[PDB]
Design a protein around this nucleic acid. Structure first.
Ligand SMILES: [Mg+2]
Ligand SMILES: [Mg+2]
Ligand SMILES: [Mg+2]
Lengths: 266, 1088
DNA sequence: ACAGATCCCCGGGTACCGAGCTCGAATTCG
DNA sequence: CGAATTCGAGCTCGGTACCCGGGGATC
């Protein structure tokens, strides 16, 4: 019936339930952008950009046709299209059916939930099922390119770095990879240093030789990255282009990422 | 010379020349701004065509119509001028307390000199002789009088003993003096108190006072323990109720009353009122002769003010007290009130004035007299000419637009403060008269700003059009547009002293706007003819016209009750110590339970909803069960000699179990008072079926205006601290009302709820059966209605038979005066809330009853759009079907399943209303909210109010300060950083109160409006009416109605400049539609 | 020196508790 | 030795109840 039918069947659904769980009540003001390739989730968190791809393999099957739609997630302005995945709401879940039946401008998306009943049974609760509608005209600025030094900065040390950052605008922190892979987060208060490679200070990345020094002037980096509560697992660095961008990705089952703008250097 | 001397300027040689020093171009550009000041030794002067005639020289013949016979004594009438008059028309009765030593050269007859002999009260009747002469007939010998129990005056004090006591008991802190035996009379008379059926006749002293001091005795001075019985009745009412049949606006005749005594014209030099022929009849030389039904050429004047403001700021609304803010020019149209004719179109100007030839030609092309423009060099010498016109020409009726608030108080404030000239003589009596404007704005308890002038009936049209039409903003431009289908061209004040500083060719444009304004006023007065409609109630009540315009509704009802009281051996007690002594026991006070509102079965109701209405319910409960004070026995001793059910009624009203006596052992006064008024509303409802569809609407509002004065009977009873409060009768009235509705519902449900019982009672319904299943189910009531949803019946003749149901239920349940009527039948009624409903009458007009679209606050823009949504629901067809389809599923179940494909037309007007709000080419005057000031703004408990905020913004920037009860316009201006330093300088998601702004200030300074406020308010209005379809919860509708509106997202632009600069891609609208997909495909590989 | 009534719904502006929020200064736990 | 849980204190802001006040409906 609906051309664009996407379903989360139980094994994959408990995959994405754990992927969404850590980000408690963040991204429930998201903007879901859905195209042929999955679904991407966007938001401003402490005035900074944050993203979450949901590519096909994540959930059971995806089928989509026509223009990419964008659904301003907060549905009826208190309830949220992604509430279903908060990992303690609707606890013993089963198949969730996102489908959109419209045509191109005025698409509308129905989130149908199903809830176990312990025989193998399940009750579709058509009491909390959601009905959103496509934003008519939506412009969202999405990261692009390929980073030039992606290092894997793992779970402890991505606390060390955010603590190494400072409180307010007085004190700009400075990421500076030097020759032979120093990768130090310098600032007036304290400094954290690493080995950059291709014994638990071996920060594994690739093509790290392309030296940079960059300075982060947003005081928010600890704020948002902690708010997301990432386990770390990569800093993505885009140096080439003006106002180089520091994005940061986690490596658990989720892929939430947060682009940090930086002041002109390298 | 005269005996009663005249107190109106008849001569002058010194005044306060004030003349803005722009009229004299013999000074360079430095002495242009400002105004002169300083006395002069010339007698004042008017130029009209290039003639000089000192303003106060009656004689050769003036630039104005002289309609007087006297001027400063010197009789200016043709010699031998002795009209005989015996049929005169009276419009205003005055009381004046003249004296015997004050009139000795009057040469009266001895009868008259005896009437006043110490002093006395002389009722001047005042009017026109049909030929045209202004007659003033002075009627002597009318004494006001108050009664007092014989016992209580025989203990507190302990006939001539009484008056000798009371005469000098007044003495302390003298304001009276020389008060002797001959100033009061007692006589023992035998009468019953009005209250309760148990109350026996007793013996009272009738105290006849000589003049206008009863109010002292009836004030707490004399003896507070003694209950004075009727002390508020005037000399005038004691003249109108005891001479039988006399009416205070009606033709009289002058008859040789008794002894063959004869009325006595005065000599011209003893005239108490500047009029042509004056007479000294007594109480009973008059007769009331009828059959003559005419209105004798009373000259209505219709005048306006235009005022300038000077000294150091020109864009400042002028203020009366300032010697420099000064009146420039005033229209004065003079009409004839018998033929609706216009003559003489006078305009008074301060200095040279022309008039554009367009104005003179438009007027002559309308058959209106050529304007007469009088050029006065000095402002005082203008406002003396103007109140020499209103004392020589002597308009009986006066009119204006906002005369009570801005025109007259400016003019009088300017005379009395700044030029110090008595206004007491410029009324109709040439000395010791009343010329007063009472403003409400004195932190007070009244609702009227009253002007009383001595013998002139100041019918303002702001009152009248604020009681006849339900219009958001009552400024003359808008009321001319709405009421006359006209297009007026305004002149905002701000540009007045730019048209004045130029030569006369722009003072002419000011005179154009004055005359064209006051001719419009004249047109509204003759459209609504207030003088006839207030005349009818002045006749019916006994109050003057001047007291039926400005003194509320307890007085007309008390006065009719007083004429019924003192013909039945009754006396009407006077309770005093009113509310600033309050109720004596040593948020809004509801003195009793008032009415029922049955629960509305909220919903759209496609089936015929046939309404039944009691016909003026309360006044037929004060008659069906003869509820008055006089039958109120509220104990059970005095109704013991009569039997239950046939001679009295028991009603637990508050728990009291009042016993109300039946009709044949005592008859009410409220039942009998109401019988006269009801036939008056019955004649004004008679005339409706035979009139024009626009002259029917004025005889619709005259019958509503008497529905209020008949139901005021009930009201007047139920007031607290009023003139005759009896909350027992009012509580009962409402009790029987609530009961009568529940009786009707337990009869319509039990009797007619199987269709075969309809067929056995009205066999004309055999063919009225529409196919569906039958149910007669009352779904709504109100103080009289009962909306009977009749399901399974065709609407075609449901009013045909419904006249029969309303005649069956009436006869079968209620007493014969009570009449249930089937006034309407709706099809497609929407029952949104308790007193709110929209429904389309059978085959035609829509009845919108109070849904935030029938009320004066809400912005015009939002009223046009919900007014189109209601049409898209009732009149349209797919939408009506769809709306009815939104009953199949509870409210919750439309938040998932889409709206059933008929309402895509409903939503279009919401997305389109949202598209229009955002356009930068909006017109502020379409987005203007407005709300009533309603109180002195310092008496407000809650001071953080939108309109209040705009009232202080107005008054702070020297602008027009809207007098109490003026609708304050206010548009809500965008929240910006200039609406946030202004609050802080005057002191952060700002309240709607502190974004209020006057639209004059919102157009001259190009401020944005809130497009969040006004659209959230449009969905607020839409939601309140349309909740009724969805379940009647406003949260579901608010969530479903706004789903229609497209939502759009962009990064806050500068951030996009930075992001773009960071080399991101824009994905959507800001690109075109094939730049979004390809690059958003790349972004995924980036983050993946 | 003045003077019909009550009932009723919304909207704006307060002033709570509170349920849900992360966000820490001890922690129990590896 | 380790730095990985917690039940405490700060948050919002929903959403209650409140008043008021505007302004209808009904007599
Ligand atoms: Mg005016
Ligand atoms: Mg009625
Ligand atoms: Mg009727």
């Amino acid at each position: 019936g609906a051309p664009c039918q996407v379903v989360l069947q139980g094994a994959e659904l408990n995959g994405i339930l754990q992927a969404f769980a850590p980000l408690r009540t963040s991204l429930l003001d998201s903007l879901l952008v859905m195209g042929d390739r999955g679904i991407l989730i966007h938001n401003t968190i402490f005035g900074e950009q944050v993203f979450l791809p949901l590519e096909h393999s994540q959930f059971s099957r995806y089928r989509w046709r026509g223009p990419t739609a964008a659904f301003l997630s907060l549905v009826d302005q208190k309830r949220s299209l992604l509430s279903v995945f908060r990992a303690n709401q609707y606890p013993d879940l089963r198949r969730v059916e996102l489908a959109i039946t419209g045509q191109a401008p005025f698409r509308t998306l129905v989130q149908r939930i199903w809830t176990t009943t312990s025989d193998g049974e399940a009750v579709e609760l058509a009491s909390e099922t959601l009905m959103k509608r496509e934003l008519t005209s939506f412009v969202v600025l999405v990261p692009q390119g390929t980073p030039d030094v992606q290092l894997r900065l793992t779970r402890p040390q991505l606390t060390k770095v955010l603590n190494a950052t400072g409180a307010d605008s007085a004190t700009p922190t400075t990421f500076e990879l030097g020759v032979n892979g120093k990768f130090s987060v310098f600032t007036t208060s304290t400094c954290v240093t690493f080995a950059a490679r291709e014994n638990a200070k071996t920060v594994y990345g690739e093509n790290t030789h392309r030296t940079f020094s960059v300075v982060v002037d947003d005081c928010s980096m600890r704020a948002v990255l902690r708010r997301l509560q990432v386990a770390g697992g990569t800093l993505k660095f885009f140096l080439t282009t003006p106002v180089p961008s520091l994005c940061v990705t986690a490596t658990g089952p989720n892929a939430v990422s947060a682009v940090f703008l930086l002041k002109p250097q390298k | 010379g005269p005996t009663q001397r005249h107190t109106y300027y008849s001569e002058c040689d010194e005044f306060r020349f004030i003349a803005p020093r722009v009229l004299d171009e013999d000074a360079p550009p430095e002495k242009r701004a400002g105004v002169h000041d300083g006395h002069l030794k010339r007698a004042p002067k008017v130029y009209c065509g290039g003639d000089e005639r000192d303003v106060l020289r009656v004689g050769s013949g003036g630039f104005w119509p002289r309609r007087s016979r006297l001027w400063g004594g010197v009789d200016h009438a043709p010699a031998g001028f002795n009209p005989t008059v015996t049929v005169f028309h009276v419009y205003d009765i005055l009381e004046n307390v003249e004296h015997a030593y004050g009139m000795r050269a009057a040469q009266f007859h001895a009868r008259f000199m005896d009437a006043i002999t110490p002093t006395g009260t002389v009722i001047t009747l005042l009017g026109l002789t049909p030929e045209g002469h202004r007659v003033a007939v002075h009627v002597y010998g009318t004494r006001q009088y108050f009664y007092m129990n014989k016992e209580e005056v025989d203990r507190h004090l302990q006939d001539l003993c009484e008056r000798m006591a009371a005469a000098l008991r007044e003495s302390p802190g003298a304001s009276f003096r020389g008060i002797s035996a001959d100033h009061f009379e007692a006589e023992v008379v035998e009468r019953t108190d009005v209250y309760y059926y148990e109350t026996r006749p007793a013996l009272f002293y009738r105290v006849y006072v000589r003049s206008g001091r009863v109010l002292s005795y009836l004030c707490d001075n004399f003896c507070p323990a003694i209950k004075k019985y009727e002390g508020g009745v005037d000399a005038t009412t004691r003249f109108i109720l005891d001479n039988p049949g006399f009416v205070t606006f009606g033709w009289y005749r002058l008859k040789p009353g008794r002894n063959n005594t004869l009325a006595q014209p005065r000599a011209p030099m003893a005239f108490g009122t500047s009029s042509d022929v004056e007479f000294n009849c007594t109480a009973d030389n008059l007769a009331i002769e009828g059959g003559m039904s005419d209105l004798p050429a009373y000259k209505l004047m219709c005048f306006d003010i235009e005022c300038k403001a000077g000294g150091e700021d020109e864009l400042a609304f002028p203020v009366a007290g300032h010697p420099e803010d000064l009146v420039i020019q005033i229209s004065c149209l003079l009409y004839d009130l018998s033929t609706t004719a216009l003559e003489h179109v006078l305009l008074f100007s301060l200095g040279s004035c022309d008039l554009p030839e367009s104005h003179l030609n438009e007027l002559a092309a309308r058959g209106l007299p050529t304007p007469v423009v009088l050029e006065f060099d000095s402002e005082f010498e203008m406002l003396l000419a103007f109140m020499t016109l209103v004392k020589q020409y002597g308009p009986e009726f006066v009119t204006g637009y906002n005369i009570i608030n801005f025109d007259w108080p400016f003019l009088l404030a300017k005379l009395t403060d700044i030029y110090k000239v008595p206004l007491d003589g410029y009324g109709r009596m040439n000395g010791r008269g009343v010329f007063r404007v009472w403003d409400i704005g004195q932190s007070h308890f009244q609702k009227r700003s009253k002007i009383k002038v001595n013998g002139m009936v100041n019918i303002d049209m702001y009152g009248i059009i604020t009681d006849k039409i339900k219009l958001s903003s009552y400024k003359l431009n808008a009321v001319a547009e709405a009421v006359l289908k006209d297009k007026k061209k305004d002149l905002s004040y701000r540009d007045i002293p730019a048209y004045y500083a130029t030569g006369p060719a722009q003072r002419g444009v000011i005179g154009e706007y004055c005359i064209q304004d006051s001719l419009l006023v004249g047109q509204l007065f003759f459209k609504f003819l207030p003088h006839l409609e207030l005349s009818a109630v002045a006749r019916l009540a006994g109050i003057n016209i001047t007291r039926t315009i400005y003194d509320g509704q307890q007085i007309r009802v008390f006065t009719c009750l007083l004429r019924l009281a003192d013909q039945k051996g009754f006396i009407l007690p006077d309770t005093q110590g009113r509310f600033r002594g309050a109720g004596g026991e040593a948020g809004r006070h509801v003195g009793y339970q008032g009415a029922r509102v049955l629960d509305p079965t909220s919903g759209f109701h496609v089936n015929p909803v046939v309404v039944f209405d009691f016909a003026s319910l309360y006044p037929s409960i004060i008659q069906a069960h003869n509820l008055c004070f006089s039958t109120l026995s509220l104990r059970a001793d005095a109704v013991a000699h009569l039997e239950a059910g046939k001679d009295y009624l028991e009603i637990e009203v508050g728990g009291r179990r009042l016993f109300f006596v039946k009709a044949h052992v005592r008859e009410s006064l409220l039942s009998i008072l109401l019988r006269d008024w009801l036939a008056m509303r019955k004649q004004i409802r008679s005339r409706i079926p035979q009139s024009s569809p626009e002259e029917a609407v004025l005889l619709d509002k005259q019958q509503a205006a008497i529905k209020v004065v008949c139901n005021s009977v009930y009201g007047f009873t139920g007031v607290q601290h009023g003139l005759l409060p009896c909350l027992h009768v009012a509580a009962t009235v409402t009790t029987i009302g609530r009961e009568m509705l529940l009786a009707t519902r337990e009869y319509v449900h039990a009797r007619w709820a199987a269709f075969e019982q309809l067929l056995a009672d009205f066999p004309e319904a055999a063919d009225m059966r529409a196919p569906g299943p039958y149910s007669m189910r009352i779904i709504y009531g109100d103080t009289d209605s009962i909306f009977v949803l009749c399901r399974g019946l065709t609407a075609a003749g449901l009013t045909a038979m419904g006249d029969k149901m309303a005649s069956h239920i009436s006869r079968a349940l209620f007493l014969p005066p009570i009449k249930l009527e089937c006034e309407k039948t709706f099809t497609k009624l929407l029952l949104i809330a308790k007193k709110k409903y929209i429904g389309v009458i059978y085959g035609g007009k829509m009845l919108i009853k109070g849904v935030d679209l029938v009320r004066k606050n809400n912005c015009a823009f939002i009223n046009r759009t919900s007014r189109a949504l209601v049409d898209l629901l009732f009149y349209d067809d797919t939408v009506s079907g769809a709306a009815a389809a939104l009953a199949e599923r509870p409210a919750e179940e439309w938040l998932a399943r889409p709206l059933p494909e008929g309402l895509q037309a409903f939503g279009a007007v919401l997305v389109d209303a949202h598209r229009r709000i955002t356009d930068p080419e909006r017109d502020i005057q379409d987005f203007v909210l407005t709300a009533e000031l309603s109180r002195h703004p310092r008496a407000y408990t809650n001071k953080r109010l939108a309109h209040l905020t705009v009232y202080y913004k107005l008054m702070a920037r020297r602008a027009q300060v809207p007098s109490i009860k003026d609708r304050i316009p206010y548009v809500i201006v965008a929240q910006t950083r200039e609406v946030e330093e202004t609050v802080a300088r005057l002191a952060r998601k700002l309240l709607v109160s502190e974004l209020a702004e006057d639209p004059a200030y919102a157009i001259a300074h190009g401020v944005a409006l809130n497009t969040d406020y006004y659209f959230s308010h449009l969905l607020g209005a839409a939601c309140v009416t349309f909740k009724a379809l969805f379940g009647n919860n406003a949260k579901i509708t608010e969530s479903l109605l706004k789903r229609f509106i497209p939502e759009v997202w962009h990064p806050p632009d500068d951030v996009a400049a930075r992001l773009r600069a960071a080399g991101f891609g824009a994905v959507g609208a800001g690109a075109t539609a094939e730049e979004t997909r390809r690059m958003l495909h790349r972004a995924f590989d980036t983050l993946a």
